[PDB]
Symmetry: C3
Subunit: 543 residues, 3 copies
């Protein structure tokens, strides 16, 4: 045989998993993975060197589901796949988010992941297999990537966690959580829940981190048999040759103008070395201020939420509307009601999917006082909308009790720290303003964690600037009864279960404070739907 | 309250108008305007400085109508808004055109206008409100913008001008004119008319300029209460340390080659300062030649139209075709006839719109002897086609008398001065060639005005070069009975009613001269439609 | 008349041809050609100089069929033409391929061809007329283009070659071949055939080269009457002030890394002059090695095919699947079966076209170990898929005997020398794996020819590197009975009939060797279609 095939078989919970390299796509770092009824081809290409003036890490992940994987011919676009669907973009982000922090600081080589679903029996989602396939392909690619990573979906059926459930099991699950981590740390959580408790949600994360260990060890042994060797790449050294005042200006526009003016002063006095070192000085300054117990940039302590303003019915002709402001973060959110003709229809490997609820998220450049080019929905816009949708999903009325198509739009009018959680609150408010009966109102809060050794602080309702210096960022949305969505991104070692427990408990108080302010304005759906909404009558006559 | 809200209420003709800032989108310069049943959010972002090597004024206006504004769910595109519709692009141009000349020469800061319709009761167009909203947002943005501007739509009902008519009033109007100006000058006119006279058309412009004054003064008082202050920006000075001969070469290709070669000679002898000063020398040279009564670049006096060639039936299988040449401006224009299946269907806030007439305008780079990248319809292409459509609309047969879908395409094959008016003539010719019975033939002419103090000259049928040096550019299309479309763009002060009256009278002679040449070839529709056109029969049998 | 019209009429086989310039689009180099019922407007723009740092020849050809040409209104896209269809892109490549090598080495001026079909009576394809129109427009454009070229389609009806057949004649043709050449040499062949012999295929090429001579001479006389004059452009001279070892490394990745490292060594020791001269040294080295009878880069002699691996059923849920590997060229090819709803539907000038077979070709950057941006189907991807489709077409079952829609996808997983012929083999294999009864299996091979004076060598199964140094590249696909597709691209003078005869005979042995290896794995369609394919039953019941 002309191929030198390396195979690794192992049992991953209820599914057999096979890792193969050496036969397909030998000119990249390519793993063909089969997990149950799903087969994915993941090719990784690592540029041998960094580009001349590259100052950031260029990583792109492109995930695709071929229609031929399930014996389908693509529909009505010249019979071609076309651009990435929203579901494909979302899975791309699931792969990108855990791997991106695992490359060392100062590693600027281009990396491209191409993950292609080439066979599916339509019984389960292919994202976990694509995530394991990416992990394995990076493990043999010869980069300083600090893997391997594992991945797992955790459901909750009959009060018990379930590892990597299929579509049929998920129809009885109160939880849809995906977690990725390394051998020692959780990295990424993306989840939707039916008002579960903080304790239930954390347990699902630790259950998933524990169960994925068998897969990480199998990737490790596979990479060894494929001849992978430790990286010798060494990070270049830096030119080893008062700050607080600017970071006490509370207004975001004026603080940056003072900081940007400080940077011009530094460049005149002292090019890429000044750019890198100047940002690190700002990085070090704001973090030690938090850890030393000083007031934050805007004067808050670690547990205080920013000032809130809650308004509904702000648009005369929208079926429901709300303006939600949290400090300098603001969302104009509307609810529109429609008939069957308006439902969202999308193609999947399992067949055509009709969805009576959709949430669209727009983040224009004027929300941060900037100019920007005009384009279609961005990967981040798609992700933030989907997370806010997860925060609202569990409290939506059942279709047979409220037979309308529902479209929510969140227009971010101001941004300074999770507009996506502002979107959850505004969606809850605008739904009730339209007369959509909710199970309960829901709110969201974005949190941060700064850690140095054994010293750590959890930050409630983080600023735009605290998002860029945190070692852990996490977002919780929920009702008074429990969590409806939990998202996490962890960049560091040593965040224990006990630490995450404190962080979620602090977030619970913040979400309850926001919910309490919301209820002063509207706490239930209006008794009638909007006067402008199309009526649903037993007899309709068309002239 | 966490907001410092500034409100200005005033009555604008038949509509109440409210101007608000300080609550929504505080990180931009943002005005929320309500005018009757329409609400628009206009955010303006002004870059604090000009970019390093910026040599032109970067201004972009993006106008959008949200479907939720009228309780609608967008149709069949993942239920998203998607890219700007043609109607949205056209309103963007309505905002851009009057504001763009009001920034001083040498002001190169980036400016971006984002105007979003967030509520509409579907009774009237939202463009005027979006234009007033842009005016107000710029007034508080701290730029050297020389506003405020006003805007107004003028109709003609029962021989009387009507200010800002709604959809129901416009169904009885013989005029659809939009004008913008400042306190002292008209800036922009865009109009469609049912063969009205020069006197009627000018009166509508002055009526609109007069009625908008109340709105300009209200914007002025609103901006003062919002704390706007005069700009201190000062234009940088220039390096203050024979031309006619090149501008007597009549052939455009050879004239530019001589001029471009002169620029290389100047650069070798004397970088951005030479580029700027070299163009200003060409600018000063051609204008004084006109004002001093010398023959124009091609030898013409101020009132002479270029040589004309008129040909119909130039394509064997097009239902109608025409080749119209005016000097070095040429349009290959076709008419195609179709059945109901071919009608243009578009979504509006008022509902789905079926249009039995469409005109598409293509401007390839080879028309000016250039290379260019391949793309979709440009903003200028969309505008020029819509203006030529306005010039043809009034003479089209009523659908119940001529039950065909009509598509006109204007392919610009040569350009040297309004291809859009060439398109009007070619559309008129090709319509008759196809057998489309017109009320009367129509023609167009593009005019220019150069003014210095009290000295001024009106230019008939302007060259490409005279378009770039004129202080007023204006286009008139019409029949022998009257004007069907009037477009104006004025960059200067002091163009009186009496002056515009002379300019339109000169344009009337030019359009009549062009029409007279057209009638020598074909003056009425052919008695039959094209032999290749689909027949319209009482009994059709499908095998 | 304001026009100086130059006309050239001649009879081209069965069609009258008219060449006209001087009336339409005078600001470019523009020819309006009528050939039978087809009229095309071809504008050529040649930049007067090369750009500052231009190091390659920027040539773009854009071909368009206007719907108005045949009295049609475009369908359901705002009634606009939109982007180039696949059929339009393919004809663009037909024009580009023969003209691109006819510009001298070192000519870097930008050239843009805009060919627009403006009238068609729907009796025949407009590509030949567009090709002749491009030839004529370049002939008057004043460039060093070494034309004119001719073009012709050759069919085979009742054992006889037919010049430029129309749609009705092509329905009885066993051949669809398009050839372009100059007065002395064939340049380009693109063809589909019903298993014809090498002798029949070569005769069609020489028939077409002979018959087009009358058209070339007419273009020559037309260009003279239009005042064309010889080019005085002279190619700039070069700075006139051991290699084998790197080109004996057989592994492609390691060979390039050694070569790229050699280039960095040369740049350190000796900027554009080093880049140009360094590539020419590699060019000269590899060609003389072949001509002197030394083993090729990977050790092969001129007639040896690379090692082969043939696998079917490699995807569990694809209706048919195959992995075909030839050295370092690999294709993952699938067959999917569908019902009538899945058929490809496209608009043509002749009407709506329903196609029950389609082949899609994807060439991701990881196939050559590279990163690349994400985009839609490229012009080269469209061409390679269409050629592989031509190689499979003749052996597909008739629709009334096999009533399924068939979609083939070729995913190139490795590339080092015609993935398009790998796609033919993989399509043949995957079709049989799905149970599609073929007339016979088909295979493909890509060939090269290096010639110096009277010394020449024909290369079987060329490497990526031999494709970049060949003077003739040609691809043959076929069954054991005969050729199903033949593609050629010739850059040089003096490739005689006798030489092409030897080259095709060598290619026949190579294709038979590949076919023989394929038949060891599967030589007939499986007796049943895939268990996962939708069944075709006389009675279907829908719940």
């Amino acid at each position: 045989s002309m191929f030198n095939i390396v195979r690794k078989e192992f049992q991953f919970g209820q599914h057999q998993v096979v890792l193969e390299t050496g036969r397909v796509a030998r000119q990249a770092n390519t793993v063909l993975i089969t997990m149950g009824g799903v087969t994915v081809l993941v090719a990784v290409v690592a540029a041998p060197t960094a580009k001349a003036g590259q100052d950031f890490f260029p990583l792109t992940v492109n995930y695709q589901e071929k229609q031929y994987a399930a014996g389908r011919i693509p529909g009505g676009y010249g019979k071609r796949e076309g651009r990435a669907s929203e579901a494909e973009t979302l899975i791309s982000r699931l792969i990108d988010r855990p791997i991106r922090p695992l490359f060392p600081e100062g590693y600027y080589n281009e990396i491209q992941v191409t993950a292609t679903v080439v066979s599916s029996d339509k019984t389960m989602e292919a994202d976990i297999a694509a995530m394991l396939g990416t992990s394995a392909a990076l493990a043999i690619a010869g980069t300083p990537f600090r893997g391997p990573i594992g991945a797992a979906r955790v459901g909750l059926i009959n009060g018990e966690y379930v590892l990597n459930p299929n579509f049929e099991q998920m129809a009885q699950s109160d939880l849809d959580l995906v977690v990725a981590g390394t051998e020692s740390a959780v990295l990424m959580v993306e989840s939707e829940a039916k008002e579960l408790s903080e304790d239930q949600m954390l347990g699902a994360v630790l259950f998933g981190h524990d169960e994925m260990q068998i897969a990480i060890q199998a990737i490790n042994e596979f990479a060894a048999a494929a001849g992978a060797k430790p990286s010798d790449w060494v990070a270049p050294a830096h030119n080893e040759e008062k700050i607080s005042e600017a970071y006490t200006i509370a207004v975001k526009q004026d603080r940056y103008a003072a900081l940007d003016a400080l940077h011009a002063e530094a460049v005149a006095q002292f090019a890429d070395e000044v750019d890198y070192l100047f940002e690190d000085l700002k990085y070090r300054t704001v973090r030690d201020n938090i850890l030393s117990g000083k007031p934050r940039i805007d004067g808050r302590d670690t547990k205080t939420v920013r000032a809130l303003d809650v308004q509904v019915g702000v648009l005369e002709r929208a079926h429901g509307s709300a303006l939600f402001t949290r400090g300098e973060t603001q969302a104009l959110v509307t609810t529109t009601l429609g008939n069957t003709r308006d439902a969202l229809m999308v193609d999947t490997l399992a067949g055509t999917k009709t969805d009576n609820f959709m949430l669209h998220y727009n983040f224009p450049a004027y929300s941060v006082g900037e100019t920007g080019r005009e384009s279609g929905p961005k990967r981040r816009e798609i992700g933030h909308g989907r997370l806010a949708r997860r925060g609202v999903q569990a409290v939506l009325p059942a279709a047979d009790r409220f037979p309308y198509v529902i479209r929510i739009v969140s227009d971010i009018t101001e941004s300074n720290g999770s507009s996506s959680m502002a979107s959850v609150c505004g969606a809850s408010l605008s739904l009730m303003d339209a007369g959509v009966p909710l199970k309960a109102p829901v709110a969201g809060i974005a949190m941060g964690l700064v850690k140095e050794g054994e010293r750590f602080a959890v930050l409630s309702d983080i600023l735009g600037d605290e998002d860029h210096l945190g070692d852990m960022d996490f977002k919780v949305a929920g009702s008074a009864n429990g969590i409806t969505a939990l998202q996490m991104d962890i960049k560091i070692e040593g965040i224990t279960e006990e630490i995450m427990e404190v962080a979620l408990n602090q977030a619970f108080a913040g979400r309850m404070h926001i919910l309490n302010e919301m209820n002063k304005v509207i706490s239930r759906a209006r008794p009638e739907i909007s006067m402008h909404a199309p009526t649903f009558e037993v007899i309709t006559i068309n002239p």
